[PDB]
Amino acid sequence: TPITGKVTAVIGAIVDVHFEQSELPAILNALEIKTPQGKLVLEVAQHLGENTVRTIAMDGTEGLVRGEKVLDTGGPISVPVGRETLGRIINVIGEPIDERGPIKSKLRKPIHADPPSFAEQSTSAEILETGIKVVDLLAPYARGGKIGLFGGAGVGKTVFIQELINNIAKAHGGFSVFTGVGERTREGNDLYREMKETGVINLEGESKVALVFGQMNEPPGARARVALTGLTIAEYFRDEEGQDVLLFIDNIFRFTQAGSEVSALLGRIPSAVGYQPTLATDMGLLQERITTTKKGSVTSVQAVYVPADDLTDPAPATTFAHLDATTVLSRGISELGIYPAVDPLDSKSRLLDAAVVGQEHYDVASKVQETLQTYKSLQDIIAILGMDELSEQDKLTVERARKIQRFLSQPFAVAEVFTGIPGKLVRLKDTVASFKAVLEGKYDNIPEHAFYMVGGIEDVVAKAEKLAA
Amino acid sequence: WVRYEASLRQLEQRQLAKSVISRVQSELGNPKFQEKVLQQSISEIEQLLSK
Amino acid sequence: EVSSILEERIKGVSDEANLNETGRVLAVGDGIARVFGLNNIQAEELVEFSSGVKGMALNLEPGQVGIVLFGSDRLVKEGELVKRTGNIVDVPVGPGLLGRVVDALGNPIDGKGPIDAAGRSRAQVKAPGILPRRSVHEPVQTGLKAVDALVPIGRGQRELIIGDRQTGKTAVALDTILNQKRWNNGSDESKKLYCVYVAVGQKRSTVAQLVQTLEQHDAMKYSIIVAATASEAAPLQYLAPFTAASIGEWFRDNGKHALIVYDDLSKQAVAYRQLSLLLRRPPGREAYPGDVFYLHSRLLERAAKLSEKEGSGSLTALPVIETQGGDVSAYIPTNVISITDGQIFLEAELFYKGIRPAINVGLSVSRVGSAAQVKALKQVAGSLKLFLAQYREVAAFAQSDLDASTKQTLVRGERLTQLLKQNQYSPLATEEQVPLIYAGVNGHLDGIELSRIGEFESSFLSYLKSNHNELLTEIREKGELSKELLASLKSATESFVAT
Amino acid sequence: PPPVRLFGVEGTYATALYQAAAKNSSIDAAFQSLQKVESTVKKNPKLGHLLLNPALSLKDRNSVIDAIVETHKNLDGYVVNLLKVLSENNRLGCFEKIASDFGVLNDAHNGLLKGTVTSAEPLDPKSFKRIEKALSASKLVGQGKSLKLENVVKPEIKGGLIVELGDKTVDLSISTKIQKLNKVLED
């Protein structure tokens, strides 16, 4: 029977219901309030006792007449999943917002689910290669990996992600999930158009990507469960279809942010900065449901816009905890004109282990790191004085490092327009070779400008010829 | 010429505004102040019966 | 006359109806009132108090409702009767708001009497979905070189304008409105932006100067000004951008192109901070509440270039951010940057150091701006950003000896920078910007001595018109520089160089 | 559920009292006895009104309770427990508050409606009666729900009247009409 209630309170999008009936829904149950907007979906999050629950409202709030009929839909919101989720952009509710009509589904699955157990997990060791030189050198990705970004704005976040979609998702043939959490509608429209164009969404046929999109205009509460919906879609592929997937999640700072917004309203004492006291728990569930298990290997990409550019803030701090590899993206390096904007002293990967990428790769990387760290160390001295007041030995090192820095900029294909340079994807084997030579100063004898914003070592040589003219 | 013409209309309106205030003070003196309560009373009787 | 209008108005007072009204004010002050009753009340209603002021119900609580007073607390007092308007906050929207200054209650502060407005529409309205959204194609032309070239600006986009206070902050935007006088006084409605200037938190005197300037350039007739001055109450200021955007959406939802400049959203942040604190909701970073992101993001994404289904309407947002010290990592600026497409960071140091207008080319980006550009302004402006980011590099390391390659770049670069500059409050025509950029790019301004650059510009334009305004008419209509035009222009420009 | 959600003003106490005694169907009885003890409390003024002032012990307060039920035997027994409860919860200032709340709750149960007809100065009894009749005739007064219309004197309402009941009001006063007129003739 529908559990009838009245809306006792409407404090923001944290509506509180008082179920008149002695029946009381459990926590994480779902409720429908009939509205002239069709329905309003609310989700029980606390029971405040005396047959008065307190519910997060997952759809927009306004117009509500305080005291109005509720019916209990029960349990977590159950999305509809299937292989026919491919070729659909779905709302948090599950509505086909791309309006390709009803999503055929066999199983409708609860948004909330319990993270797979320690035992069930299978831990990969596969290398995934992007063809982005800087990624390859500094932080080799892994297939099934959890990849992480520390966002530029969209100016950096979208661009980085677009390159990844271009590379990885054409190097993947399995299922792929795009989950866009609190992102601008335009980015989605561009992506949707682009995906359709590159047939990744084939409409005549079927896609190979599925998309979940949550706009940044969406109410905070709605934004909170956009992620979980995606997490379920991923689970269906991971488990039920039992094939390797791919996943993109951006912007998961918004997930954190959304949580911080609702927490205060919920009544929770807000922890430092402002972040929710439940920051750790929420992060834990999210990041343990993307795990590579024996059921399936899901390469995941998570993108956190650095709050006010402070990495020390608790939200980035808890992000660092659940990343197989990280690639912090920094405004300074963007200002240096290096695209990608990756800090080269702030990238790490678990597969940066020497054996894993072979001693030669590791030795090359070691030398790059040492050289650049020296160069950063002498950034003070160079600036306070000149670079001609450097010790001669160091001055050579510095000149080499200046070249290395310029070398790191590679034009990117899906941003070829934006850069204004036709893109480049350079082989990993080539990358190791290229840096090795540079470290031995083989090609150090030709302009720093030649190294700048061009691809491989061969390209540098050719651009020296261009410059020579 | 058009601008000052509009200004004169505004000046006339504020002059007639202070005359409205003067008329209000006069109205509230009268035991029309008393007698019109009866008018409101019967009007409310008609009104609320029309509800 | 005045008697007849007043008499018509007096006649228009006629009887009060019974209905659910009346709450009684209790604890009041701190700009929120706690009212007893109002048992059935729609959420986010407008209530009008019998203190003759209106407020928006915020907190619907068991047994009490907490109105937020949209207006002065001075007249509100305990045990006053609060009457339900019965309606969610809506503001009149229509066509007749054009060329009318109004305040945030839509009261004509131009005082041209009652505004003609087709409808009223709810203050908060969700942004259109993915499906209604067509990628930008039409440009917005500001008439200022580099602000169209180096910074390519196109319709629908939320194109940020960030910079430091009172660097003639307003002027960049005013110039845009002025350049588009030409097109907006056009007959093609596809070439009609209806531009809305939202003035928030500015001195009423300053706004009056702005109004007077706009009426001096006779620009009032295609533009609306909404005003929520610094004196005007903070809850009114909070609702001020949202209301303006509703009006903008009526034009947009006529499928007609429009633009809205939100001056200054940073002051909305301070207002929302004030409001939040007075609602004693916990403060966020820099004491700006945690829903500040939600506030800006919900506002900003209502500005869009819709699809053909929606009649391809635009509502190009230009939001004006006031950075405290050029604090580009500051919470409010960064939050805005992440929402917005591009940045138009204005270089304050250069502004002071005689570059008017001063655009920090490095800190100016436009995410999808460049495909709004017309082909003439893609071809002519081809790689000029790179060249002047070679000038940026060149002058970086200029600070001893200069190789002839470097020197050549420096000589061009310095001179090109001079060319960018414009006289504040006097923008150039779009047509005119094409040759000027042509000249420098095609290296005609390489030789021109630095002292005569200003002369070169005026004389070059006069020359072009006198010699053959035919070329300019062609580039005006074609909007693409043909090979013949390119050669003809090379020849013509060289001809001007000679003189 | 109990008619009208009061609560908070120790009206959770009133609610509790009501529902507990409602199934004992001795709410009228309770209300009457509560009125009687409340009345003899008000009519005990020398440190029985001024010893409603809290400063007593738990035990001493309890001995005040024992004196209160010594004062009469004619209590619901649920309200004898209510006296204990207030002593235990260490309030006695919200005793007439609870009494008033229970009265409101009770007369909601009775279905007696309450109105008000604020005026500038008290008006004719013929007018009072005409309004009472009119309101009772009108749909505003519910069927079998009996209005207790109170004319109140409020000088602040300049002339006219405001009729109030069932959170539906008509304020056709002189002050309000003048207000509206002024505004409309300032435009």
Curated annotation (Swiss-Prot), chain A:
Known EC number: 7.1.2.2
Residue numbers of Phosphothreonine PTMs: T73, T198
Source organism superkingdom: Eukaryota
GO biological process: proton motive force-driven ATP synthesis; proton motive force-driven mitochondrial ATP synthesis
Keywords, ordered alphabetically: ATP synthesis, ATP-binding, CF(1), Hydrogen ion transport, Ion transport, Membrane, Mitochondrion, Mitochondrion inner membrane, Nucleotide-binding, Phosphoprotein, Transit peptide, Translocase, Transport
Any one annotated GO CC term: mitochondrial intermembrane space
GO molecular function terms noted in the UniProt entry: ATP binding; ATP hydrolysis activity; proton-transporting ATP synthase activity, rotational mechanism; proton-transporting ATPase activity, rotational mechanism
Enzyme class: translocase
Residues that, per the record, bind ATP: G151, G152, A153, G154, V155, G156, K157, T158
Subcellular localization(s) per the UniProt record: Mitochondrion; Mitochondrion inner membrane
Similarity remark: Belongs to the ATPase alpha/beta chains family.
Additional information: Present with 164000 molecules/cell in log phase SD medium.
Protein name per the record: ATP synthase subunit beta, mitochondrial
Organism: Saccharomyces cerevisiae (strain ATCC 204508 / S288c)
Gene that encodes the chain: ATP2
UniProtKB/Swiss-Prot annotation, chain C:
Keywords annotated in UniProt: ATP synthesis, ATP-binding, CF(1), Hydrogen ion transport, Ion transport, Membrane, Mitochondrion, Mitochondrion inner membrane, Nucleotide-binding, Phosphoprotein, Transit peptide, Transport
Coiled coil, from the record: none
Recorded GO CC terms: cytosol; mitochondrial inner membrane; mitochondrial intermembrane space; mitochondrial nucleoid; mitochondrion; proton-transporting ATP synthase complex
Residue list for modification Phosphoserine: S14, S135
Entry keyword Ion transport: yes
UniProt xrefs under PROSITE patterns: ATPASE_ALPHA_BETA (PS00152)
Subcellular localization, as worded in the UniProt entry: Mitochondrion inner membrane
Main location as per UniProt: mitochondrion
UniProt site positions, description: Required for activity: S364
UniProt GO BP: proton motive force-driven ATP synthesis
InterPro entries (alphabetical): ATP_synth_asu-like_sf, ATP_synth_asu_C, ATP_synth_asu_C_sf, ATP_synth_F1_a_nt-bd_dom, ATP_synth_F1_asu, ATPase_a/bsu_AS, ATPase_F1/V1/A1_a/bsu_N, ATPase_F1/V1/A1_a/bsu_N_sf
Positions of transmembrane segments: none
MF terms (GO), sorted A to Z: ADP binding; ATP binding; proton-transporting ATP synthase activity, rotational mechanism
Signal peptide (UniProt feature, chain positions): none
UniProt: ATP binding residues: G163, D164, R165, Q166, T167, G168, K169, T170
Purpose: Mitochondrial membrane ATP synthase (F(1)F(0) ATP synthase or Complex V) produces ATP from ADP in the presence of a proton gradient across the membrane which is generated by electron transport complexes of the respiratory chain. F-type ATPases consist of two structural domains, F(1) - containing the extramembraneous catalytic core, and F(0) - containing the membrane proton channel, linked together by a central stalk and a peripheral stalk. During catalysis, ATP synthesis in the catalytic domain of F(1) is coupled via a rotary mechanism of the central stalk subunits to proton translocation.
Note: Present with 41500 molecules/cell in log phase SD medium.
NCBIfam families: atpA, PRK13343.1
Protein family membership: Belongs to the ATPase alpha/beta chains family.
Record-linked PANTHER family: ATP SYNTHASE SUBUNIT ALPHA, MITOCHONDRIAL
Protein name, as recorded: ATP synthase subunit alpha, mitochondrial
Curated annotation (Swiss-Prot), chain D:
Single GO biological process annotation from the record: proton motive force-driven mitochondrial ATP synthesis
Organism, as annotated: Saccharomyces cerevisiae (strain ATCC 204508 / S288c) (Baker's yeast)
Assembly and binders: F-type ATPases have 2 components, CF(1) - the catalytic core - and CF(0) - the membrane proton channel. CF(1) has five subunits: alpha(3), beta(3), gamma(1), delta(1), epsilon(1). CF(0) has three main subunits: a, b and c.
Keywords: ATP synthesis, Hydrogen ion transport, Ion transport, Membrane, Mitochondrion, Mitochondrion inner membrane, Transit peptide, Transport
Sample GO molecular function, one term: proton-transporting ATP synthase activity, rotational mechanism
NCBIfam families: ATP_synt_delta
Lineage, highest ranks first: Eukaryota, Fungi, Dikarya, Ascomycota, Saccharomycotina
The UniProt record lists the keyword Metal-binding: no
Xref: HAMAP family: ATP_synth_delta_bact (MF_01416)
Transmembrane segment boundaries: none
PROSITE patterns for this protein: ATPASE_DELTA
Protein name: ATP synthase subunit 5, mitochondrial
Gene: ATP5
Family per similarity comment: Belongs to the ATPase delta chain family.
Subcellular localization, as worded in the UniProt entry: Mitochondrion; Mitochondrion inner membrane
Domain of life the protein comes from: Eukaryota
Role this protein plays: Mitochondrial membrane ATP synthase (F(1)F(0) ATP synthase or Complex V) produces ATP from ADP in the presence of a proton gradient across the membrane which is generated by electron transport complexes of the respiratory chain. F-type ATPases consist of two structural domains, F(1) - containing the extramembraneous catalytic core and F(0) - containing the membrane proton channel, linked together by a central stalk and a peripheral stalk. During catalysis, ATP synthesis in the catalytic domain of F(1) is coupled via a rotary mechanism of the central stalk subunits to proton translocation.
The keyword RNA-binding is assigned to this record: no
Residue ranges the record marks as coiled coil: none
GO cellular component: mitochondrial inner membrane; mitochondrion; proton-transporting ATP synthase complex
Residues spanning the signal sequence: none
Any further remark recorded for this protein: Present with 32400 molecules/cell in log phase SD medium.
Predominant subcellular localization, coarse grouping: mitochondrion
